[PDB]
Design a protein around this ligand. Sequence first.
Ligand SMILES: CCC[C@@H](C)[C@H]1CC[C@H]2[C@@H]3[C@H](O)C[C@@H]4C[C@H](O)CC[C@]4(C)[C@H]3C[C@H](O)[C@]12C
Ligand SMILES: CCC[C@@H](C)[C@H]1CC[C@H]2[C@@H]3[C@H](O)C[C@@H]4C[C@H](O)CC[C@]4(C)[C@H]3C[C@H](O)[C@]12C
Ligand SMILES: CCC[C@@H](C)[C@H]1CC[C@H]2[C@@H]3[C@H](O)C[C@@H]4C[C@H](O)CC[C@]4(C)[C@H]3C[C@H](O)[C@]12C
Ligand SMILES: [Mg+2]
Ligand SMILES: [Zn+2]
Lengths: 33, 1337, 251, 153, 151
Amino acid sequence: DADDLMLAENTADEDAAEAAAQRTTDPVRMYMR
Amino acid sequence: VYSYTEKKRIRKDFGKRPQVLDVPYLLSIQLDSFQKFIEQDPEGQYGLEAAFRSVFPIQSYSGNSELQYVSYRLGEPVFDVQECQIRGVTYSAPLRVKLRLVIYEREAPEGTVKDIKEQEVYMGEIPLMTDNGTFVINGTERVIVSQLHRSPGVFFDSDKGKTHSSGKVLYNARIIPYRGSWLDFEFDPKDNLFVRIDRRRKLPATIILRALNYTTEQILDLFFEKVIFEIKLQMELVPERLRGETASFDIEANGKVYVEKGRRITARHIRQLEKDDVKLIEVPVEYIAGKVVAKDYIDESTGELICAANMELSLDLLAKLSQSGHKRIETLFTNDLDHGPYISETLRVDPTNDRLSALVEIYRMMRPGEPPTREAAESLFENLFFSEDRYDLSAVGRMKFNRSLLREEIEGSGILSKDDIIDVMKKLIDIRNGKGEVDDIDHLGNRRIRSVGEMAENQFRVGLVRVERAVKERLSLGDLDTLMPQDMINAKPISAAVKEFFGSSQLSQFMDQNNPLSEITHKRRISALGPGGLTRERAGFEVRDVHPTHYGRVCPIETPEGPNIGLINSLSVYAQTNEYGFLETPYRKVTDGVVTDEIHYLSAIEEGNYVIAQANSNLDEEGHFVEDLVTCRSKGESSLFSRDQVDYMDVSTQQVVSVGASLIPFLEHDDANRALMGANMQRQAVPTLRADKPLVGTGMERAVAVDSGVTAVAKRGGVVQYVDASRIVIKVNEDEMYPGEAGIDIYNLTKYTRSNQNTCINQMPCVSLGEPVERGDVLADGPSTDLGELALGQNMRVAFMPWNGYNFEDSILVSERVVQEDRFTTIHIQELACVSRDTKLGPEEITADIPNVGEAALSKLDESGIVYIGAEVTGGDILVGKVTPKGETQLTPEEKLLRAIFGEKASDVKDSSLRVPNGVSGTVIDVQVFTRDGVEKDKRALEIEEMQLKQAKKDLSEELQILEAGLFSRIRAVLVAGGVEAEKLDKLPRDRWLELGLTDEEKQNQLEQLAEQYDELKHEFEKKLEAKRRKITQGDDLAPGVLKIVKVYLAVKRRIQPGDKMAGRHGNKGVISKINPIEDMPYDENGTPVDIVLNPLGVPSRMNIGQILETHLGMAAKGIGDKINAMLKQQQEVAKLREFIQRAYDLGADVRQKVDLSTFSDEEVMRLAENLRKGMPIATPVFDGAKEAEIKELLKLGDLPTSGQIRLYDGRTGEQFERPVTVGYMYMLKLNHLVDDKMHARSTGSYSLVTQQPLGGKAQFGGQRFGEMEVWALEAYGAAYTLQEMLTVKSDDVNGRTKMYKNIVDGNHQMEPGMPESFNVLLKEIRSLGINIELED
Amino acid sequence: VPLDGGRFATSDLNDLYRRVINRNNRLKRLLDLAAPDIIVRNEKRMLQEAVDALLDNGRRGRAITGSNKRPLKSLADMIKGKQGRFRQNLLGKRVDYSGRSVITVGPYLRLHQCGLPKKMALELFKPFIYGKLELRGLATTIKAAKKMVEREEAVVWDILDEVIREHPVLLNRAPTLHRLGIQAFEPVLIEGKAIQLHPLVCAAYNADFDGDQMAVHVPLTLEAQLEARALMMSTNNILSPANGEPIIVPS
Amino acid sequence: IGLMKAVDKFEYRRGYKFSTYATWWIRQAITRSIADQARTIRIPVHMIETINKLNRISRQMLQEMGREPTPEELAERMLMPEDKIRKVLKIAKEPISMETPIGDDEDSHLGDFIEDTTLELPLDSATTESLRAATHDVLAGLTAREAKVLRMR
Amino acid sequence: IETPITANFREGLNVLQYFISTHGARKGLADTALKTANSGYLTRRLVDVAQDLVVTEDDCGTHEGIMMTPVIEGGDVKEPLRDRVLGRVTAEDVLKPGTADILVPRNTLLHEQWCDLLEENSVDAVKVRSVVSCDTDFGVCAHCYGRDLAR
Ligand SMILES: CCC[C@@H](C)[C@H]1CC[C@H]2[C@@H]3[C@H](O)C[C@@H]4C[C@H](O)CC[C@]4(C)[C@H]3C[C@H](O)[C@]12C
Ligand SMILES: CCC[C@@H](C)[C@H]1CC[C@H]2[C@@H]3[C@H](O)C[C@@H]4C[C@H](O)CC[C@]4(C)[C@H]3C[C@H](O)[C@]12C
Ligand SMILES: CCC[C@@H](C)[C@H]1CC[C@H]2[C@@H]3[C@H](O)C[C@@H]4C[C@H](O)CC[C@]4(C)[C@H]3C[C@H](O)[C@]12C
Ligand SMILES: [Mg+2]
Ligand SMILES: [Zn+2]
């Protein structure tokens, strides 16, 4: 979910080089892991 | 014959076309829906029964205990509607349901039960609908508008190649359930089928097939056909299949010849092949090199899979299979053009090989970041669909699903099955291959109507499932005895959803109460917004447009203009909702040739496959179509059809328009834009002091007025036995009295009540003592109704001419005698409240002694500090006197010196009293006091309670004694036979009526029963009186911290003035510019001035020439009225009066109306003539109006010119205007845009807290927003100083604005500009981050 | 801030600061107990998340919501957007000495003057009237002047007529598409509650008399009055600025 | 935190399966933390318990009698002077978010309609200055010793 | 649609003709709303890009400019030289079409009289100073702009 949102945010960056070149970030999922 | 209320004033009716179907009850959607919601349905499928059946019974884990639902009921509301409105509380009924808890024991899961406990549990209060279609939620009257949402089912759409430059169109099928997840299919540019559950990441379609336990061979069997071969190497030829061939090898049958190579096989070749019975042919080996094997063909010798199913068949593979003995093979038949390969490509891309992998991929898709568990994935898949608890394909959903796939079973399961998904996939493939067509999303056969009685059910079910989950969790632990089925249920979880839907919802909004029309048209309104519906940000176009399917169902004209135009529509006149929620409309059926008289209600989809003749189609006297060819509308278009191939006909000419747009006369002559504006404005008219029927109408006035609910309509016929400004007592006829009733009805009228728009709601009787009535007659016409007809405006004498620039753009010039006669004077009632609270320093007090008031403003206050009722107050006067304690307030030096010099003490109390707002001036008509339970009830409250108790006792006593009079009258009537006493009956007193001696016959039993009924009335009266005293003398449930409230009602009377907005019914609005003296207005040769002057230049550009025709017809009608008035003043006998009225009532070309005065008694004729002396009302149906020749004829009946134009003179100079002008009578409206509600000025006031800017709005005495475009405008000029003073000193320069004020009051116009507050706040906010933003010097 | 009753209203920054401080104090307490590294790592991740939400909420992860189940406004959200300090309050804001009302024709006027209601004129020019009353000796202090204008005595209207004599007022209509949507006129005191607008200027405003409204502002300083008289007067703008053609043509 | 406290105060002599000596500490810690840092205007622990008890009694009464409990009935059923009940009911609940969209017409927020009640009106400032001027004028109309004495006191 | 509305408003429209008229009117209203939405965004961008331009000099002294000639779309002329040249400053001497002498020397604001003179002598090409070829730094000069057009 967060990874999907992060990817969507990165895609909108172009509307460049950094985004083109470019875990879950949830503090609870990492704690569970 | 005519109705008694209708024979007082008969409206002359043009409209050749006859009427076959009466207009239905206008506001029926609301009442039907809510009736369905709250109703004991034996086979539970509607309302609360359905929800309870769906949820209960609830089973705990392991089935140790079961909670069951039995029945439900609604208790009577504690407060009635009026008391709810007064008290500011909801009108609702409490829901009490009989639950039953059964506890089981080990070894008997369903056998012997340990114990069963029954109990009634109360779960929430449900608001009730008033008998007009509204809800009283917090004292205010709400309306819940229907919703137009896309119905559940399966819909096949495409993108018509919008996103692709290749021009290819990607089809996609979507399955929408009533509640659940959207199983969505689609294509891919590479012709790869895909499926996206819940619009999540795309997956290959075939995965789901495997998730349904399908093998590859089964998939290919389902979606593809096959061809076979025999061995040598002989093939069984099917002539039909080879529609395109010869690319590899033409034919080899019987050896000799069938067709040559190269030439493409044609139809004749297939005909020859079928004639010759070709069943075996030979083909080269290389021909099979391109085919794909259908099933699995293992090396039977070695048990090794040579080629898996759906794999390219090569010559080496042919050799291997032949060595294996596979003399026969199956290859998927597929021709590129028609039977394209699409599932095979999906298989090529399939990342799964078995059910487990598919389930794992689905599990990852649905919930990412989770470990794929073998047990969890199957459960998730089987739970997503196929479960009654998480997925519902409603009965309408199932009906449309089956109908779309072309099945025969209307009914079925609400959960998807494998067959359904396979059939949807096959349908999508068929659409893509070129067979079939896509669906239209705006077709009203695909859109459904939700109504309050269904949305309330949905919200209640949400609450009920929440409570079910809670009770299941509670039962999961303990399961002890002595646990009644009432401690696990709390009302609040269920009541929250219901009260939130009714209180704060998109579709639940304050009612419009400008006039009856606004209410009627607000109740029958359809909205595409709301929960489950699209939003304005991304809605149109192509859903805001008018569709051919709206004909007869949704009005094309009436729609709001603005951000949401086309998203909110109005139900047409005859439109009705199907059993499934689809709009339908009536059509009069046509047999072989005759237009029968039985109507069938057809729906959008069902209507397509007929041809329906137009309503304006001539019919013979026998019922046949006169014209050989008749214009009728087929599937989508309209054209001429033979007289013998029409199977339906429109039921009316107003069938297409709504109620609002069907009240515009001469709508055919108005442009669509102007008709839209005219309807929208007609909804806004303000009721005036005295109602005035339209001289030119359409005939829909009476229906709107009666069905609106603002009138008092008789429920039974009788004779008016008492009339008064506040009640009507009717004495029912013997034919409708019932066995044991007194037979008298009492109608209590609403007098000077406030509406949601702060207007007056006043009912006044229109009957007289001894006047007969019949059921359905109006007894007391409400606001904006005149003798039962809607009357929104006034009939004004108008002239179309310029007149000196005082009607320049859209301005209106009004005479001063329109203001002397109070024709547009309106009454506005407003409420003001004064809440006293308990503050930290002490409680606030309501008193008549206020600090530093010179006793001049305390005159109108009584001893208790509240204004006298009936007092006339103006702006600044005190209504309720209040004081608030304050702190020390250290006095500055100098003020201390002033106090010392003049020896004055500190007040110690503020003056937070309620006073009339500035610019208002009215009279106090009502005061009511609310006090906490534990307070002293100051003298005024006790006085109000005393008068209220007196009124209650008086009402009950009057009821009881009037009913006693009726009962004793009926008893005396019965005492005429069967032991009759006539001379001696009256001697003994009335109290002995009950003890009269009579023969041993049933009549004495009847009298005894009536006496017992009277005793029952006595007991009921005493009980109700005691209960009402208790209800009056109690406390109140006020907010926390408020000690008491005082509410004062002011009745303001607003006269028309320059700046007020006026309008007609044809979209012609304007603003009054001048009130001209009577001797300055243009006049005709008889000296009669003109009330209003309008600009003719407004008519050509705005092509709404219906106002000119209305003006001509109003002139004609007023001419007839003036002739009747002249004959009546001269005291002419009834013979000539009757002859002239009869001559006037039969004009035109074969009009439908026929009124014969020979059956009118002289009294009836004289009353009719006296009601027609101000003009004969005229009806001009919407698309069946009066022709111009008829207008000329009606003008000629009066002595008026047929041109419609007369010669006028100038009041100022007396010289005649050249080129005569058009005068007539037009119906003018006073829209609710009054200048005294719009004038606002500010010098200085209160400022906002966080940012020190002037507050906003007229209520807060706010300023004007000076935006960015105005800043650009001031920059275009070199106005740097004006811009600076507007940016800093006038807005948020805290210490610069006080200096500016002091400078101005010192006669020095100079400013020290300074720095605004917003920039300082911005610096502090940017600095509150890690940034360091400073102001370098 | 306390609202009427026992209720309160608070900004979303208090919640974010409270979360940051709670997690920081909890971490400080935790580092004294010598807890397992799992716990301190989780605490530090939470602290980073809370500071991130405070500085900018809804940019790295999910936006933290409140009781009303809406995303909380952060420090960054108070600067950006069409509803931020940069746009909503710094380039356009509400103003004192302003009013609005419906417009009527008034065809008797001259091109440089408008019709202003007596009530609006009395409300907009209150400090000027106080100054005049005190200067002419009619009132002793400013409180006496306030009471005089509040009772609307006879001298008050003569003083108002004297104040208005040569004092332009700027009239503006809401869709200000070009610079001729603001113009300065000289008031003429009238009865009623509607503003009378010269016909020839309507085309400049694109104004019709079927219900439109106009806003009126009053320049205060000497420089502002002179700018209105010399730059923005209606008799100075008779040519369109886009081309050379007149924009005062009879309609 | 509660678990780390238990693990330090746990002994195997009793034989309580940890999942019985530990849940108590976890529940205590979580409940106390909720009662200490869950609402902006902090309410003591005992008052939180009183509010919860009042809510439970109100729920029971609502289910039983059917309509609603009133403060008098609540006091009777809860054994309180009927003023403590009102005081507890008058607690300020939870502050309204100041950004709650309330305009519904231009995305206005609740915080745009709250006025600054401590600002001094511009007319009162002018009145103060005028009073100062009047005092200065009058105090110059008496012997210098009197003026000095009055300015000194 | 092939079949037109054969009725006017003096005569009435029947139900079908009015239905088609409604089809048209709804779209008209929606298009008006959309146009008002777009024309504001364009203006906002145009102001943002070119807000800080100000006349900040009297003459940059440049000798370059645009060559103004009438606009012709194949056949007739739809904008004479007077419209395109009135109110500008000549960048070079306007030699008479006979090449005799200078008709308009230089740096002369071309008002109505000069335009009438040019029309009389039938010249169809002038060299007028333009903003896009101004030598001023951080702004524009009054001679390369022209005249106010509002004063
Ligand atoms: C024979 C006709 C009967 C009818 C005219 C008589 C019989 C009973 C009378 C009413 C009742 O007394 C109750 C009220 C008494 C008040 O004092 C005056 C009003 C009140 C409605 C009465 C008016 C009228 O007089 C009534 C209807
Ligand atoms: C969509 C707009 C919501 C807004 C209009 C609704 C939502 C919650 C309502 C407030 C709260 O109840 C708290 C207070 C209760 C007091 O009794 C009256 C004031 C008070 C602020 C209420 C006024 C208003 O009713 C509010 C702001
Ligand atoms: C339709 C928009 C409603 C809006 C105009 C009404 C509805 C509720 C009103 C606010 C609430 O009462 C809460 C506060 C009460 C204080 O006493 C004055 C400020 C306060 C914010 C009120 C100002 C305003 O009056 C509000 C926002
Ligand atoms: Mg307008
Ligand atoms: Zn230059």
